[PDB]
């Protein structure tokens, strides 16, 4: 324990747990009947893991001697109590079919049980991340109100309404998606889960209120579900909401396929105020180390493009697998591959996540074979020791949390990457081959001339290397499945910014800066050109309040009282004011070719009349259909705004609406909807 950092997870090791399948700490809170499967023989029903389960693993040391520092759990909220019609008889085991975002899942525990978890975590220096699924409710049939629980939504016990007879319009009624488009996937039902209508005021206040209730329990971060299923506008406004309240590390899950790259996803991580699960890394690692569909070359381009795709790559959440994929380990598979991926992940950029049981070599392909009940608590396996060693390095060498990545050597087989932050450096070499061997010559490093023992202690037949003149490393052999890790750390005395969190705020919010060379004597901090009042200074970390600057993006520099000034940390965003989700609708907006409609206006959130920063393209198929376009935008509340719509080509062309500006006074503490006509 100590001063936990809710907005800086770069130095953490995450352990993702699906509650139901971990440990059954309290058998008395077990469900019975068709909801329960004794022995977990049927993986689609409740098996029994509850919160007590977890506190036991925290207290008996399994998690803590592993080097785990943060725990990620299922959505704690009350789920539906009905069973599915399917062959299996599917229950809400996974905590994804919410019923009431304001009460606990009684199978997992009470509210108090809940509080004992966080605390049990806290006392031992372990952060807590909870799943939160604001997109939908539960599986429903409009036409068959008997189906499950009609996707019923409760408010602390009181009903709001179901999918059938939605007088209120709490949900969407545009069929389910086909994933034919981004739009298709937001305003349509993900499968048959009842899709919440975030534009609705009741809904918008209800979800925002709930998140708060949980934060109040003292969690440390949130993991958002079906990130590419909610609008964008609304989500940004929710992030505005948590930040004003009490900043917590938040990240969304935008599933990406094996060779998938999507600029929209890039944009989401960069602008929403929330970071993202790193699928590109995920899938990519999977290719080279488990699928043999790619090599290091791919991996390397992956790393390079990734650092340029994301403004804060350091904020991405990494993994070799999760609740949603086929476990890394296959039956009959080679367990050392796991060890290898683990060693790779723990030393890579981004916040590293380990899926429960990875360290036990658990197997299972597809849902729900990928969610068996925790097999063993064997603390002696190779996987576990590698986490042990690497978790300590990561806690120790800053290059791991904040350094960039440089390729020092590579074969389709051999990859030797370097991590550096200031003088801090960690060198890593891996031979993925099972049979070919190599002799690493002409290897060059940032490590100070010397002798280095493998940071693994030879767990993967790691060697001792020697650094001579000119950063030249002495030739050495690298056999099949070999992994060696060498690090160098030293005091800094030049101000270096390692991380900034959050990356979004209002005037007067609290921003935390992490680094080195800050110096014990409090200096000065700047946002662009303005000095920021500081609340606390240390050579490692400084907390400051955003100065009173104009809305926009600013660079952050650090100047020690000795005059040194740090390189800047880019893109801190200062928002005009409290955000609200507004639905901008435009009628009779006909178009050409690639031509699309956008929105631009007089406020920062709407680009300040710069068509290069216009919001869009706008939607025109679901809620409204072309020639009518719509979009949900996050914008300042209680503000009279001016905006116009524009048609933008494939290659830049801009066609303005041709008359006076459209005016509108954005609502306060709630959503708004505005519809106008394209002024020809
Ligand atoms: Ca139980
Ligand atoms: Ca949706």
UniProtKB/Swiss-Prot annotation:
Start and end residues of each CBM20 domain: 574-680
Region (A1): 1-134
Keywords carried by this UniProt record: Calcium, Disulfide bond, Glycosyltransferase, Metal-binding, Secreted, Signal, Transferase
GO terms, molecular function: alpha-amylase activity; cyclomaltodextrin glucanotransferase activity; metal ion binding; starch binding
Subcellular localization, as worded in the UniProt entry: Secreted
Cysteine pairings via disulfide bonds: 40-47
The protein's required cofactors: Ca(2+)
GO cellular component: extracellular region
Region (D): 492-575
Domain IPT/TIG: 495-573
Annotated stretches, region: E: 576-680
Record GO biological process: carbohydrate metabolic process
Region (A2): 199-402
Span list, region B: 135-198
E.C. number: 2.4.1.19
Cofactor note: Binds 2 calcium ions per subunit.
SUPFAM superfamilies: (Trans)glycosidases, E set domains, Glycosyl hydrolase domain, Starch-binding domain-like
Keyword set includes Metal-binding: yes
Site for Transition state stabilizer, residues: 324
Catalytic activity reported: Cyclizes part of a (1->4)-alpha-D-glucan chain by formation of a (1->4)-alpha-D-glucosidic bond
Domain of life: Bacteria
PANTHER family attached to this UniProt entry: ALPHA-AMYLASE 1 (PTHR10357:SF215), ALPHA-AMYLASE FAMILY MEMBER (PTHR10357)
Quaternary organization: Monomer.
Family designation: Belongs to the glycosyl hydrolase 13 family.
Note on domains (UniProt): May consist of two protein domains: the one in the N-terminal side cleaves the alpha-1,4-glucosidic bond in starch, and the other in the C-terminal side catalyzes other activities, including the reconstitution of an alpha-1,4-glucosidic linkage for cyclizing the maltooligosaccharide produced.
Name by which UniProt lists this protein: Cyclomaltodextrin glucanotransferase
Annotated organism of origin: Geobacillus stearothermophilus (Bacillus stearothermophilus)
């Amino acid at each position: 324990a100590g001063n936990l950092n809710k907005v800086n997870f770069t130095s953490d090791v995450v352990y993702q747990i699906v509650v139901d399948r971990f440990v059954d700490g309290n058998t008395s809170n077990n469900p019975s009947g068709a909801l329960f499967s004794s022995g977990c023989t049927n993986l689609r029903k409740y098996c029994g893991g509850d919160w007590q389960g977890i506190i036991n693993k925290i207290n008996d040391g399994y998690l803590t001697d592993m080097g785990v520092t943060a725990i990620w759990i299922s959505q704690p909220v009350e789920n539906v109590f009905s069973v599915m019609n399917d062959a299996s008889g599917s229950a809400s085991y996974h905590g994804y079919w919410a019923r009431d975002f304001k009460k606990p899942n009684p199978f997992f525990g009470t509210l108090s049980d809940f509080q004992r978890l966080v605390d049990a975590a806290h006392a031992k220096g372990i952060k807590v991340i909870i799943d939160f699924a604001p997109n939908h409710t539960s599986p429903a049939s409009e036409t068959n109100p008997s189906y499950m629980e009609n996707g019923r939504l409760y408010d602390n016990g009181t009903l709001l309404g179901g999918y059938t007879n939605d007088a209120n319009m709490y949900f969407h009624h545009n069929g389910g998606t086909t994933f034919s488009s981004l739009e298709d996937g937001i305003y349509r039902n993900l499968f048959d889960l009842a899709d919440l209508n975030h534009q609705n005021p009741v809904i918008d206040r209800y979800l925002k209120d709930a998140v708060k209730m949980w934060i109040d329990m003292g969690i440390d971060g949130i993991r958002m579900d079906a990130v590419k299923h909610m609008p964008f506008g609304w989500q940004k406004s929710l992030m505005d909401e948590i930040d004003n309240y009490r900043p917590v590390f938040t990240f969304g899950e935008w599933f990406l396929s094996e060779n998938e790259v999507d600029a929209n996803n890039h944009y989401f991580a960069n602008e929403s105020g929330m970071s993202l699960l790193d699928f590109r890394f995920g899938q990519k690692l999977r290719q080279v180390l488990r699928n043999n569909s790619d090599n290091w070359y791919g991996f390397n381009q992956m790393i390079q493009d990734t650092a340029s795709a994301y403004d804060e790559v350091l904020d991405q959440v990494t993994f070799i697998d999760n609740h949603d994929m086929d476990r890394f380990m296959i039956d009959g598979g080679d367990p050392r591959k796991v060890d290898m991926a683990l060693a790779v992940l723990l030393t890579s950029r981004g916040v590293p996540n380990i899926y429960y049981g990875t360290e036990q070599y658990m197997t299972g392909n597809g849902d729900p074979n990928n969610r068996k009940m925790m097999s063993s608590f064997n603390k002696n396996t190779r996987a576990y020791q590698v986490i042990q060693k690497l978790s300590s390095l990561r806690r120790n060498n800053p290059a791991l949390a904040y350094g960039d990545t440089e390729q020092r050597w590579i074969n389709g087989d051999v990859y030797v990457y370097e991590r550096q932050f200031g003088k801090d450096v960690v060198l890593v070499a891996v031979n993925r081959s099972s049979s070919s061997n190599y002799s690493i010559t002409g290897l060059f490093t940032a490590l100070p001339a010397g002798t280095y023992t493998d940071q693994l202690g030879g767990l993967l037949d790691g060697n001792t290397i020697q650094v001579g003149s000119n950063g030249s490393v002495n030739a050495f052999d690298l056999g099949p499945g070999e992994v060696g890790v060498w690090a160098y750390s030293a005091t800094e005395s030049t101000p270096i910014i390692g991380h900034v969190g959050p990356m979004m705020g209002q005037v007067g919010h609290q921003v935390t800066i992490d680094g080195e060379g800050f110096g014990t004597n409090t200096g000065t901090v700047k946002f662009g050109t303005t000095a920021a009042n500081v609340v606390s200074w240390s050579n490692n970390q400084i907390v400051v309040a955003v100065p009173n600057v104009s809305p926009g993006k600013y660079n952050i520099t650090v100047q020690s009282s000795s005059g040194q000034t740090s390189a800047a940390y880019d893109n801190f965003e200062v928002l005009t004011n409290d955000q609200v989700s507004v639905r901008f609708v435009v009628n009779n907006a006909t178009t050409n070719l690639g031509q699309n409609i956008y929105i631009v206006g007089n406020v920062y959130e709407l680009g300040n009349w710069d068509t290069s920063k216009a919001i869009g393209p706008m939607f025109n198929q679901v809620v409204y259909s072309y020639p009518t376009w719509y979009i949900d935008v996050s914008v300042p509340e209680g503000k009279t705004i001016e905006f116009k719509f524009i048609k933008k080509d494939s290659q830049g062309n801009v066609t303005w609406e041709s008359g006076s500006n459209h005016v509108y006074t954005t609502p306060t503490n709630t959503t708004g909807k505005i519809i106008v006509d394209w002024q020809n």
